[PDB]
Each structure stands twice: as structure tokens, then as C-alpha cells.
């Protein structure tokens, strides 16, 4: 099976340079052209450059002179030399390889993470969302954790490690003076929840932060 | 230089019925027994985007039968046959007639389901926000469709049209349904001169509006 996976994304300040680099296994990797691919907030594509199996490359103008593409067919990797990096260059870098020829992109690799700001990495702080108590009455009650004022993205939320996958809402961070802030909400049976534990996981790698909160009821 | 516009940005769609995207490069391509350079791509939910069409008509292998493109001069467009759940996604064409190539700027495919209204649920800030000083109330209005909502605020009565950001998750891969997150947020004092705190929805499943919201008088 064919296989490409990226790495080296992380924060870097205006005017710094960053390496990406691109593993590949399962194919005769000097056989094909490969290629750099970018995504930004817009969830817009853009097609940043390439090398083909002859060993002539090509560039977007936007990233010309300042992005360097290149392989080692000795080890099989594809490599991304960023540098002058700009605020606009922000974004998740993939690699991909021809289907055939210089014909299309496949086997997309997840993508490695690139943030170009002069924000400092801070961890973000989780609180708990309980009910304003309210009898309820009901059958279902919402839980929640406020992630807030962290950097640079992105943070993982799971509750009771994934024991609890479905009522999940987890939405998208949102930036305010330079420091993102989400939310995710759970709703689980009346029966559930307080008399079984309900805890929200959130992740935030860029701090190695892997921070536990349990969500108990507002004593009335 | 080429620019490719893609239509229409958001697509609704019922589950069994055709789906149509349009592509258009501001270049006419050549070739009508010579190979064409565009393609198609769908990047699902979360996930990083795939090939579906190349040299503008043929499938990868893979993609359903359903999926089929089509093009002539500066116009293309990819079409399915009858829309599965499976196809939720955005959708993205490629021109690569020239260096360098160039994305279209997508269409969001969005699966058409019945109305629903929303179920909101309002809170408090926690004990532990107000000990450091901050004071955020959350507001989360889940599972509805259509996507369009409004979420008013109101302090004492007080509309409250400043402060309050916004958050939406993209389609359910269950239901299908929109959730949303409102969240207002103020300093512990700012937060203490008032005790009335509403969260006000009105969405187009009902004329009259959903009311949800707390006192600090109490727990």
C-alpha cells in the first residue's frame, strides 16, 4: 500500500525558516512526481509546488524563491525548505504523489500543521458546564468544558476517553486577541449523570498538555 | 494566469436527487481528443482530500459510479447521479493546464433533512472561571436545521450585542442536523452588577422564540 506521512510543522516567527518533511513507503518513489498542497483557515486548497521523477521542479509565485522543494531518493523522503516565512503562510501542509505521470494527487498524507506568528505557546484552561441545577425532569441533560485562552491550535476534547462518542459537540476555536477559546457540550441520560462520572479530556500537544476536569453538579 | 471559480459555495441537496457543480477558468482549455487537465476532488469530513476525477471524465478507482464529470472549453462540472450520506463533503476542482496549477474554491455539499428546532441549553460561569477572575455564560444550541439562526442576548432585559462570539460545527455524520455554541463573555465585576442573565433564539421552525436562561440568586 502507498503511503506518505508529514512532519515537522510547529510555530515559527514572521521572517523564520521551517523544514517539512514527507515519508514515503509502498511505491518506487523516484518513479513519480510529488507535490505540496496547502490549507488554510478559508478551508481553502493551494497547490504550492512540485518535483517530477525528471528532477525539474515548479513553484506557485506566491512561495517562489522562498519555499524549496526537494527529495532524497536515496531515503525515500520529500522535503519542504521554508523560509522568509509569512503570516499568509499559515497553514496544514500535505504531500502527494502523481497517480501516474505528472496525473493527479493521491494517497494525501494527514498533513503536518505550520503556524507563522509571534504569539507565544500557552496552555489553554478548562472549565466545567454544569446546570444551573433546574429539577430537569428530563430525560437528557448537557454537560460541558470551556477550553480557553490557548496557543496556537489545536486542541482535542473526548469525554470519558471516548467512552462517551455519541451527544458530542465539539466546536471550532475561535480567535480573540491572539489566543483561541472552544467549547464542547455532552448530553447524556438523566440516569447517568451525577450518579456515574462524566469527564471531558482536552489535549493541547503544542504545551504537552493532556488535562482531565470532572464535571460535578452546582450544590444547591 | 488562470483563476477558477467554483459554484455555487454551499450546495443543499435531498438524499436521492442529482447534484450539479460548476467550474469555470477564466482560460479556455483546449482538447477534444487530446487529454484534458482537470480533476475533482472531495475532502470528507475531517479528513484529507481524494482524487475522484482526472483528465476531466475518467474515476479513480474506488469512487462510486454515481460520480461522473463533464466539460467542454472554460466551463466543467462534476455531477452524481443520486446523493448518498456518503458524499457529504467539500468539493474541490483542479485545473492543471498550466504551472502553476489551480484549486477551484470549493462547494460545500450539504444534505437536506426535515426542520428541526434547536435545544438550548444555557450555563453559568464556574465557580473556578469566576476564583481567577473571568466570567464567561455559555449557551449551546444543539441539533437543528436548517443551519441559519439567531441567538439575541439579554442582561436585565437588556439586549446584549457586543461581547458575544459564535461557534458552529459542521453537518452531523448521524443526524445530519447543525449545532451551535454562544458565548458571552465579561470580567467577574462587570459580571456581579447584573443578575438576569437570557439566552433568545428564534428559529425559522417556530415564530415564537425559545428562552433559556438563569439568575445568579440561585445555584
Given at each position: ?7 515537522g510543522?510547529g ?17 518506487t518513489?523516484s518513479?513519480?512526481?510529488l507535490s ?8 481553502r ?7 517530477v521523477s ?7 509565485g ?5 519555499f ?5 531518493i536515496?531515503?525515500?523522503?520529500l522535503?519542504l525548505?521554508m523560509?522568509?516565512?509569512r503570516?499568509?503562510?499559515t497553514?496544514?501542509?500535505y504531500?502527494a504523489?502523481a497517480?501516474y ?6 494517497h494525501?498524507?494527514q498533513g503536518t500543521?505550520?503556524?507563522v ?7 489553554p484552561?478548562?472549565?466545567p458546564?454544569?446546570?444551573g441545577?433546574?429539577a430537569?425532569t428530563?430525560?437528557m441533560?448537557?454537560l460541558?468544558c470551556?477550553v480557553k485562552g490557548?496557543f496556537?491550535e489545536?486542541v482535542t476534547?473526548?469525554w470519558?476517553?471516548?467512552?462517551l462518542?455519541?451527544?458530542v ?8 486577541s ?8 455532552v448530553?447524556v441520560?438523566?440516569?447517568?449523570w ?5 469527564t ?11 488535562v482531565?476536569?470532572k464535571?460535578?453538579?452546582?450544590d444547591? | ?5 467554483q459554484?455555487?459555495?454551499?450546495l ?35 479528513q484529507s482530500?481524494k482524487?475522484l476525477?482526472?483528465k476531466?471524465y ?5 469512487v462510486?459510479?454515481?460520480?461522473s464529470?463533464?466539460?467542454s472549453?472554460?466551463d466543467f462540472?462534476?455531477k452524481?447521479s ?19 496549477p489551480?484549486?477551484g ?6 444534505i437536506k433533512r426535515?426542520?428541526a428546532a434547536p435545544?438550548v ?7 473556578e472561571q469566576l476564583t481567577?477572575?473571568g466570567?464567561?455564560?455559555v449557551?449551546?444550541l444543539?441539533?437543528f436545521y ?8 439579554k ?6 450585542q457586543?461581547?458575544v ?9 448521524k443526524?445530519?442536523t447543525?449545532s451551535?455554541?454562544?458565548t458571552?463573555?465579561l470580567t467577574?465585576?462587570?459580571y456581579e452588577?447584573?443578575n438576569?442573565?437570557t439566552?433568545e433564539?428564534?428559529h425559522?421552525?417556530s415564530?415564537?422564540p425559545?428562552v433559556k436562561?438563569?439568575?445568579?440568586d440561585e445555584?
Amino acid at each position: 500500500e502507498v503511503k506518505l506521512v508529514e512532519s515537522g510543522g510547529g510555530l515559527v516567527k514572521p521572517g523564520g525558516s521551517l523544514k517539512l518533511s514527507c515519508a514515503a513507503s509502498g511505491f518506487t518513489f523516484s518513479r513519480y512526481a510529488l507535490s505540496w498542497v496547502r490549507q488554510t483557515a478559508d478551508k481553502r486548497l493551494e497547490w504550492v509546488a512540485s518535483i517530477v521523477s525528471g528532477g525539474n521542479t515548479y513553484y506557485s509565485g506566491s512561495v517562489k524563491g522562498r519555499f524549496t522543494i526537494s527529495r532524497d531518493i536515496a531515503r525515500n523522503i520529500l522535503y519542504l525548505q521554508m523560509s522568509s516565512l509569512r503570516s499568509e503562510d499559515t497553514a496544514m501542509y500535505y504531500c502527494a504523489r502523481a497517480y501516474y505521470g505528472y496525473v493527479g494527487l493521491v494517497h494525501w498524507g494527514q498533513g503536518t500543521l505550520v503556524t507563522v506568528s509571534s504569539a507565544k505557546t500557552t496552555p489553554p484552561s478548562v472549565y466545567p458546564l454544569a446546570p444551573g441545577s433546574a429539577a430537569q425532569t428530563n430525560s437528557m441533560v448537557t454537560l460541558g468544558c470551556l477550553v480557553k485562552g490557548y496557543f496556537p491550535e489545536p486542541v482535542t476534547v473526548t469525554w470519558n476517553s471516548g467512552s462517551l462518542s455519541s451527544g458530542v459537540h465539539t466546536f471550532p476555536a475561535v480567535l480573540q486577541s491572539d489566543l483561541y477559546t472552544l467549547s464542547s457540550s455532552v448530553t447524556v441520560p438523566s440516569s447517568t449523570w451525577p450518579s456515574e462520572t462524566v469527564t471531558c479530556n482536552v489535549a493541547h500537544p503544542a504545551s504537552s498538555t493532556k488535562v482531565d476536569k470532572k464535571i460535578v453538579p452546582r450544590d444547591c | 494566469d488562470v483563476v477558477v471559480t467554483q459554484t455555487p459555495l454551499s450546495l443543499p441537496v435531498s438524499l436521492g436527487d442529482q447534484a450539479s457543480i460548476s467550474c469555470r477558468s477564466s482560460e479556455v482549455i483546449v482538447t477534444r481528443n487530446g487529454y484534458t487537465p482537470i480533476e475533482w476532488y472531495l475532502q470528507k469530513p475531517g479528513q484529507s482530500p481524494k482524487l475522484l476525477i482526472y483528465k476531466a471524465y475518467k474515476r479513480f478507482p474506488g469512487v462510486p459510479d454515481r460520480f461522473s464529470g463533464s466539460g467542454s472549453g472554460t466551463d466543467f462540472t462534476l455531477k452524481i447521479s443520486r446523493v448518498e450520506a456518503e458524499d457529504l463533503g467539500v468539493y474541490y476542482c483542479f485545473d492543471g493546464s498550466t504551472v502553476p496549477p489551480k484549486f477551484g474554491g470549493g462547494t460545500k455539499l450539504e444534505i437536506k433533512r426535515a426542520d428541526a428546532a434547536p435545544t438550548v441549553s444555557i450555563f453559568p460561569p464556574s465557580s473556578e472561571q469566576l476564583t481567577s477572575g473571568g466570567a464567561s455564560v455559555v449557551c449551546f444550541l444543539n441539533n437543528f436545521y436548517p443551519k441559519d439562526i439567531n441567538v439575541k442576548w439579554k442582561i436585565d432585559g437588556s439586549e446584549r450585542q457586543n461581547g458575544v462570539l459564535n461557534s458552529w460545527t459542521d453537518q452531523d455524520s448521524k443526524d445530519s442536523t447543525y449545532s451551535m455554541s454562544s458565548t458571552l463573555t465579561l470580567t467577574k465585576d462587570e459580571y456581579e452588577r447584573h443578575n438576569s442573565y437570557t439566552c433568545e433564539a428564534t428559529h425559522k421552525t417556530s415564530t415564537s422564540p425559545i428562552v433559556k436562561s438563569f439568575n445568579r440568586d440561585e445555584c
